[PDB]
């Protein structure tokens, strides 16, 4: 279930410790010889895979910004990649926690970026999550159900299920990412079901 202790474990640890995320801005990629799904990178040397054929031909040889959860494989990302740009101005995404059934206070987290990937809203929440409600937790295993929706004004909605252990390995956890899937920063807000 979603009370096996390792997994709540890597989980946790994978969105919880820094230095697990990759986040570079205005970086080029290498000129090296890789696959139709995939870039490396010089941040540590990065495999930064995505889901479809055409995704990376978007990003070559062109400056990105990489925000993205990394395993050793030396690294490899699961998208997390988005054309750099110029107007970093802070944007705050409104979070809406509801912690058992109970409504809690206005949240938010900031992104700087006009576009922001799934990715990078996902891993902002899940550590703001870990830090005020410790969702993950294994010694009282108070949460078990959860979830994280980004419902954005298209009419569409995005959910990351907060206890998918994939197969139990890292990159079994980030593969959910790969479609390196972006959305507008001020078009859209989160909802948080923990429970």
Same mark, same amino acid.
């Given at each position: 279930?979603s009370?096996?202790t390792?997994?709540?474990h890597?989980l946790?640890?994978?969105y919880?410790?820094?230095?697990?995320?990759?986040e570079?801005?205005?970086?080029?990629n290498?000129?090296?010889?890789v696959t139709s799904?995939?870039?490396?990178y010089?941040?540590?040397?990065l495999?930064?895979?995505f889901?479809?054929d055409w995704?990376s031909?978007?990003?070559k040889?062109?400056?990105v910004?990489?925000?993205?959860?990394?395993?050793q494989?030396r690294?490899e990302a699961?998208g997390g990649?988005?054309?750099?740009?110029?107007?970093?101005?802070e944007?705050?995404?409104?979070?809406?926690?509801?912690?058992?059934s109970k409504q809690?206070p206005?949240?938010?987290? $900031?992104?700087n970026?006009?576009?922001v990937?799934?990715?990078e809203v996902?891993i902002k929440?899940?550590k703001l999550?870990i830090?005020k409600?410790?969702i993950?937790?294994?010694?009282?295993?108070?949460?078990?159900?959860? $979830?994280?929706?980004?419902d954005?004004?298209?009419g569409?909605?995005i959910?990351?299920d907060?206890?998918?252990?994939?197969?139990?390995?890292?990159?079994?956890?980030?593969?959910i990412?790969?479609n390196?899937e972006?959305?507008?920063?001020t078009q859209?807000h989160?909802?948080v079901?923990?429970s």
């Amino acid at each position: 279930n979603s009370y096996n202790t390792t997994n709540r474990h890597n989980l946790e640890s994978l969105y919880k410790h820094d230095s697990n995320l990759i986040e570079a801005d205005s970086i080029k990629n290498s000129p090296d010889i890789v696959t139709s799904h995939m870039l490396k990178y010089s941040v540590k040397n990065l495999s930064v895979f995505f889901e479809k054929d055409w995704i990376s031909q978007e990003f070559k040889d062109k400056e990105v910004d990489i925000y993205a959860l990394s395993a050793q494989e030396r690294y490899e990302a699961f998208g997390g990649i988005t054309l750099t740009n110029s107007e970093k101005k802070e944007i705050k995404v409104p979070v809406n926690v509801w912690d058992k059934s109970k409504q809690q206070p206005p949240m938010f987290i $900031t992104v700087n970026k006009p576009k922001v990937t799934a990715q990078e809203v996902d891993i902002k929440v899940r550590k703001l999550l870990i830090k005020k409600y410790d969702i993950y937790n294994n010694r009282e295993q108070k949460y078990s159900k959860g $979830t994280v929706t980004l419902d954005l004004n298209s009419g569409k909605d995005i959910v990351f299920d907060l206890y998918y252990f994939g197969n139990g390995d890292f990159n079994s956890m980030l593969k959910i990412y790969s479609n390196n899937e972006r959305i507008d920063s001020t078009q859209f807000h989160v909802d948080v079901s923990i429970s």
